[PDB]
Ligand binder design. Structure first.
Ligand SMILES: *[C@@H]1O[C@H](CO)[C@@H](O[C@@H]2O[C@H](CO)[C@@H](O)[C@H](O)[C@H]2NC(C)=O)[C@H](O)[C@H]1NC(C)=O
Ligand SMILES: *[C@@H]1O[C@H](CO)[C@@H](O[C@@H]2O[C@H](CO)[C@@H](O)[C@H](O)[C@H]2NC(C)=O)[C@H](O)[C@H]1NC(C)=O
Ligand SMILES: *[C@@H]1O[C@H](CO)[C@@H](O[C@@H]2O[C@H](CO)[C@@H](O)[C@H](O)[C@H]2NC(C)=O)[C@H](O)[C@H]1NC(C)=O
Ligand SMILES: *[C@@H]1O[C@H](CO)[C@@H](O[C@@H]2O[C@H](CO)[C@@H](O)[C@H](O)[C@H]2NC(C)=O)[C@H](O)[C@H]1NC(C)=O
Ligand SMILES: *[C@@H]1O[C@H](CO)[C@@H](O)[C@H](O)[C@H]1NC(C)=O
Ligand SMILES: [Zn+2]
Lengths: 589, 194
């Protein structure tokens, strides 16, 4: 008769009534993405609406059970997951206004027009064009046309989100996002929300030196294109960052390459010679994942999955995805080609599929990752281990006479660094700005005067043209125009190397870390599937401590990964000046 | 010469809660045709081996045929616990008989969702060995009963499998037939030569 007794019965019904309404929605969503017609949209919408209505009804009617009497550990957290969802209940009249505001704010970004739509033509100028003037006007124009219409709408958005956060006994909307890492346990495995601000603020100081060096070379390797256009002791302009906003530096590689006479490790020609196809690639990936002790792929995987372009004139999107529809259904959707780039994605998706298969035995509410970064971090180490010279030689796609050169290693390390390390200050800065704005500490009348103040101080990027408060820069990002957390990547970047170091140490590899390999080892995969089977049944502190042996993030493994690049680069700074000055302005010398 | 064949290859099978009973008497037993089926995933015979079937025979034999999932096959055994082993069908500890199961996904699936198979997930107490209950009374969870119709804290006691062709392996439909013997005062008739 106790409350726990009623809770158990209420949960044992939900665990089975959710599994159908989830399966129908998953199948409806998959069929539209597979076939694309004018009639499947209605079915998908109907299934989604039914599932959402069922979930919202159950979440509201599950709030009549107090949590204080629950004794079992996992049973309390199942209701914690069920009850917190649906917290966006503040006012019926205001809900429609908020939804209309969100849709209107998202609409302009989708239908953005600039003389060329965002995807076909606007991206090419920022990604490949090397003309100063062409990018100079384009970067300003994208903000001037699309951005200026988004500023007034964003004013009420923050107020409404703050009111919604204060409805649920929170402080600000940022603290609502910060609740994906909050956990309550014994003295040894507890995490409090306000610590997440501090811990990250630690993990950025130790990366401060290395990034500084990465700011130097590029600065002295972009001098050649523009001899007397940018000062050699100031901040890098935003429009010369290889992207519209500056998230990645990966497209500056042709401008800054140390040794252009040595080609990178490419095996596309060897694949062409031997007449490979998609099934061979996926069988090679299956071999890679089974050699490390993990299980194999089910029978239905090869029959129900789509693994090529449909050449029968039907339209598809076929963006690379992996689907766990539910109840034993696993599929992978990707337009396969015969280049080396898809070889990495083959392992990347199989990692997600294996992680999904790992925790199928847990209750329905616990079938997910430990937090918002584990799921993606698991699938990156497989691509890292599948792109090494040793694996390529062992498989057979590479001649046995191939050797390894120091210049090749340096170039590979710089290529990976320009993609990974360069995105951390930007990711941290955006979240810091958003958190401060949500707190409301920053005055509304000086937002730009504050935003650029961060840009020089943190990431060292200076605007080319002065701007007033009319503009609204952050809305230019897709992840900002739509409500989405932006702190996932910072955690995933650290977690992948944190896992890789431990796995390679268990595999007993001798040599530098970046030349590791985890194949032919049934111990590392066995240890990994120890945490992959947990799912969300235990807090992520236990999941982390099972593998690495600690309780918190450490950035030392990432510094150990780039030790050769750091040491080799350190010599080139002797006849140069490292750092930037917050003293120069575009209008005054 | 009783037709064991029609019991196995029958047109329709029943739900787990309404487990059908077939009584066979005054005939002969032919176990070669059952052994040579080559389509049995599980063939666990408990106290049953072809070595000594030709010296002792029984009087009457009971057969039970139903449809279950793929991962619930292991629960049809003496002493097993779970949901189907205490609310639907229990084997007595002193059980002498055979259990046969086979995959039948090709016949009992529909893209839109087959909803003609049911199972019971709530009850007041465990079922006695070889006991059945098809009660439609609304199961009661809390101390306070509800006036014959459900809604809050009251739950209907039956739920249906939504079989579809593209499920996994442990969720695909399976057909199970259990054969048991009796040793009453009737004349021992079911045993044949050669
Ligand atoms: C996890 O639990 C520990 C339990 O000791 C918390 O430690 C608290 O630390 C503050 C700061 O010194 C003390 O004033 C408290 O007395 C300590 N105990 C408690 C129960 O608060 C710790 O803050 C918790 N959170 C984290 C992230 O470690
Ligand atoms: C695959 O690689 C082999 C490597 O020798 C190629 O072989 C030669 O191809 C030319 C024509 O392109 C022939 O004249 C030669 O006789 C082939 N062999 C030798 C020993 O040189 C081959 O063409 C490549 N492609 C395929 C699909 O076989
Ligand atoms: C995973 O499943 C595959 C089949 O999909 C297994 O592959 C077969 O393994 C047997 C082992 O004796 C070989 O004889 C077959 O030729 C293999 N392929 C096929 C097409 O059946 C595989 O062994 C399974 N798991 C493991 C341990 O890798
Ligand atoms: C139950 O009915 C099926 C009907 O198909 C029987 O299947 C036959 O099996 C024999 C071999 O035992 C084959 O020679 C036939 O071709 C099959 N089909 C036909 C047309 O009958 C099955 O044998 C029957 N059950 C038992 C236990 O005998
Ligand atoms: C998708 O739908 C069209 C129209 O019904 C049909 O012709 C086609 O076979 C379906 N499947 C594929 C592979 O496009
Ligand atoms: Zn991924």
């Amino acid at each position: 008769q106790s409350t726990e007794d009623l809770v158990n019965t209420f949960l044992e019904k939900f665990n089975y009534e959710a599994e159908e309404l989830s399966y129908q929605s998953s199948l409806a969503s998959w069929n539209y993405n597979t076939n694309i017609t004018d009639e499947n949209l209605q079915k998908m919408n109907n299934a989604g609406a039914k599932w959402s209505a069922f979930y919202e009804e159950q979440s509201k009617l599950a709030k009549t059970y107090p949590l204080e009497e629950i004794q079992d550990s996992t049973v309390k957290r199942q209701l914690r997951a069920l009850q917190h969802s649906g917290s966006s209940v503040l006012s019926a009249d205001k809900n429609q206004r908020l939804n209309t505001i969100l849709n209107s704010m998202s609409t302009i970004y989708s239908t953005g027009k600039a003389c060329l739509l965002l995807e076909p033509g606007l991206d090419d100028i920022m990604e490949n064009s090397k003309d100063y003037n062409e990018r100079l006007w384009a970067w300003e124009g994208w903000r001037s046309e699309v951005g200026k219409q988004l500023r007034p709408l964003y004013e009420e958005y923050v107020a409404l989100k703050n009111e919604m956060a204060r409805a649920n006994n929170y402080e600000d909307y940022g603290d609502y996002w910060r609740g994906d890492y909050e956990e309550e346990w014994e003295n040894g495995y507890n995490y409090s929300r306000n610590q997440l601000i501090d811990d990250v603020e630690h993990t950025f100081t130790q990366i401060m030196p290395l990034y500084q060096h990465l700011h130097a070379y590029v600065r002295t390797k972009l001098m050649d294109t523009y001899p007397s256009y940018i000062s050699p002791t100031g901040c890098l302009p935003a429009h010369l960052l290889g992207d519209m906003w500056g998230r990645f530096w990966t497209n500056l590689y042709p401008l800054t390459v140390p040794f252009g006479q040595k080609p990178n490790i490419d095996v596309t020609n060897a694949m062409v010679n031997q007449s490979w196809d998609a099934r061979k690639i996926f069988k090679e990936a299956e071999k890679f994942f089974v050699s490390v002790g993990l299980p194999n792929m089910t029978q239905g995987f090869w029959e129900n999955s789509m693994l090529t372009e449909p050449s029968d004139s039907w339209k598809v999107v076929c963006h690379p995805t992996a689907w766990d529809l539910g109840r034993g259904d696993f599929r992978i959707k990707m337009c396969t080609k015969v280049t080396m780039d898809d070889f990495l994605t083959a392992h990347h998706e199989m990692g997600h599929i294996q992680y999904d298969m790992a925790y199928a035995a847990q209750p329905f509410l616990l079938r997910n990752g430990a937090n918002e970064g584990f799921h993606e971090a698991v699938g990156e180490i497989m691509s890292l281990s599948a792109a090494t010279p040793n694996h390529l030689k062992n498989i057979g796609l590479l001649p046995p006479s191939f050797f390894e050169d120091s210049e090749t290693e340096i170039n590979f390390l710089l290529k990976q660094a320009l993609t990974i390390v360069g995105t951390l200050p930007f990711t941290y800065m955006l979240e810091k700005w958003r958190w401060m704005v949500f707190k409301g500490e920053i005055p509304k009348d000086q937002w730009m005067k504050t935003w650029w103040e961060m840009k020089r101080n943190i990431v060292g990027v200076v605007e080319p043209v002065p701007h007033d408060e009319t503009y609204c820069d952050p809305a230019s990002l897709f992840h900002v125009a739509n409500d989405y957390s932006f702190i996932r990547y910072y955690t995933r970047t650290i977690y992948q190397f944190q896992f890789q170091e431990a796995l390679c140490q268990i595999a007993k590899h001798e040599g530098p870390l970046h030349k590791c390999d985890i194949s032919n080892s049934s111990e590392a995969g066995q240890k990994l599937l120890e945490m992959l089977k947990l799912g969300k049944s235990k807090p992520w502190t236990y999941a982390l401590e099972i593998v690495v042996g600690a309780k918190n993030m450490d950035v030392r493994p990432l510094l150990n990964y780039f030790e050769p690049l750091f040491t080799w680069l350190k010599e080139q700074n002797r006849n140069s000046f490292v750092g930037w000055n917050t003293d120069w302005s575009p209008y005054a010398d | 010469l009783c037709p064991f064949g029609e019991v196995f290859n029958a047109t329709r099978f029943a739900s787990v809660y309404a487990w059908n009973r077939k009584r066979i008497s005054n005939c002969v037993a032919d176990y070669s045709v059952l052994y040579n089926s080559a389509s049995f995933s599980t063939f666990k015979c408990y106290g049953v081996s072809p070595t000594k079937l030709n010296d002792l025979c029984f009087t009457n034999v009971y057969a039970d045929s139903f449809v279950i999932r793929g991962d619930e096959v292991r629960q049809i055994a003496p002493g097993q616990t779970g949901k189907i082993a205490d609310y639907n069908y229990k084997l007595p500890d002193d059980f002498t008989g055979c259990v046969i199961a086979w995959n039948s996904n090709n016949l009992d699936s529909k893209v839109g969702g087959n909803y003609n198979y049911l199972y019971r997930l709530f009850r007041k107490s465990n079922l006695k060995p070889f006991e059945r209950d098809i009660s439609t009374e609304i199961y009661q969870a809390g101390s306070t009963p509800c006036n014959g119709v459900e809604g809050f804290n009251c739950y209907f006691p039956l739920q249906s499998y939504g079989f579809q062709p593209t499920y996994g392996v442990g969720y695909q439909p399976y057909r199970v037939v259990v054969l048991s013997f009796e040793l009453l005062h009737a004349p021992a008739t079911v045993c044949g030569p050669k």
